[PDB]
From a paper:
Here we studied metal-preference evolution within the natural diversity of the iron/manganese superoxide dismutase (SodFM) family of reactive oxygen species scavengers. Only a few metalloenzymes have been rigorously demonstrated to be cambialistic in vivo, including some iron (Fe)- or manganese (Mn)-dependent superoxide dismutases (SODs; SodFMs); metalloenzymes that play an important role in cellular reactive oxygen species defence. To study this process, we leveraged the existence of naturally Fe-specific, Mn-specific and flexible Fe/Mn-cambialistic SodFM homologues, which differentially utilize these metals to catalyse the detoxification of superoxide. By combining phylogenetics, biochemistry and structural biology, we demonstrate that SodFM metal utilization can be evolutionarily fine tuned by sliding along a scale between perfect manganese and iron specificities.
CPR Wolfebacteria represented a striking and highly unusual emergence of dimeric Fe-preferring SodFM1 containing SodFM3/4-like HCterm and VD-2 residues. SodFM1s and SodFM4s were found in uncultured CPR Wolfebacteria (c). Although SodFMs are a well-studied protein family, with over 50 WT protein crystal structures available from various organisms, we were able to uncover additional diversity via application of bioinformatics and phylogenetics on a dataset of genomes sampled across the tree of life. This included the novel categorization of the SodFM protein family into five distinct subfamilies, the first comparison of multiple members of the largely unstudied group of SodFM4s, and identification of atypical isozymes such as the Fe-preferring SodFM1 from CPR Wolfebacterium. In some cases, such as Nesterenkonia alba SodFM3 Q/H, a single residue has a major impact on the preferred metal co-factor, while in others, such as CPR SodFM1 H/Q, mutation at the same position had a negligible effect. Importantly, consistent with previous reports, comparison of four protein crystal structures of the WT and mutant SodFMs we determined here indicated that metal-preference modulation by XD-2 and Q/H occurs without any significant changes to the secondary metal coordination sphere within the resolution limits of the solved structures.
Residue numbers in the entry:
A (entry chain B), B (entry chain A): 2 to 203
Amino acid sequence: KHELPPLPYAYNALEPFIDAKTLEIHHTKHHQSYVDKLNAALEKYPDLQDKTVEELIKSLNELPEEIRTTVRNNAGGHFSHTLYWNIMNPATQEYIPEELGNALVETFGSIIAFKEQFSKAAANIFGSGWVWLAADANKKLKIVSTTGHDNPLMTGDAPLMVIDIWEHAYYLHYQNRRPEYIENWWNVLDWKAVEERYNALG
Amino acid sequence: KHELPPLPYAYNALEPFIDAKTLEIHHTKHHQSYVDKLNAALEKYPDLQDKTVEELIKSLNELPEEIRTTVRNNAGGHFSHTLYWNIMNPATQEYIPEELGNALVETFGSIIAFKEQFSKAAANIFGSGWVWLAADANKKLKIVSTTGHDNPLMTGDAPLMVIDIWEHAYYLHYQNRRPEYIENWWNVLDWKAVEERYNALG
Ligand SMILES: [Fe+3]
Ligand SMILES: [Fe+3]
């Protein structure tokens, strides 16, 4: 049975960039519910309780039709919120590690250029979705926009970082001012965590 | 140039079912934006500036590809928000007009049965979307769920009423408790307006 991972920090630890109430609801209501709903679907097909969230996402078309959609949405949700919590950290002096910084500069023109493109893709999401940094099988980086809780695992890629652009992520403190939310979010991005995932790809 | 119609009632008029702040922002920021965005997409195409939001939606596939998506989304948005404001009114005593009442009973089992199925479809929306009551060429009724600002004009149907299930519609007062928002919304549904649209279909 999958379980809601605790946040690596307190509900009020990302203030003022993300408000405490949101963080608490975002985790204990929105994320919790993806877990609950994933759990209930897999209970009908227990042989799938032994799969990782990621191998579920990558094998959607082999799951029974009955639950395929629930899983795509809810495993997607669980996975995507898990990454989101884990690549944020209480506001720390920005230091980008060399390996990740160099790759960003090589790919986009500079750090600022990547931030701009990422910010812009996030501003341009229509409806509920996410904006990712992701690597392909060959460690090539791209910025990816997705709808719902779809994600790059589905297109055979390795997610490195992501921002939640569902309105629930920012409405209580920013209402419609999503760009202000995106700009604030950079202050709690944990580059160290992003580096870790990058590095692990070898 | 398309314009933002004013609300048919005060910003505080749907309290406590819909809060004033939401109404202000939902209208002056979110709705305004679909208008502004629609206008900007049409700037290069004076031949299309003469068309109604509805004939734009009906002609998506024939529009220039450059703007097809922006129009779908922003005409969709304009149209859908416009109906939404206009099918709400300050909370009064429920009176459902006979023609509409009879059709609902004939189609669903009873009024309560229709409210249940409608409420349920709205509760089960994944992501950003809307739930509609809609009529076909023959005034047969159905409940339709859509994603984004997609809408039943796209399937050749006549929209009668709709509820906005984007999170911005309800997050400030209900946060994650969408069912509570759905339940409260029935109190300000203007059945007379719904009847009027039904009646017009002959
Ligand atoms: Fe979220
Ligand atoms: Fe809306």
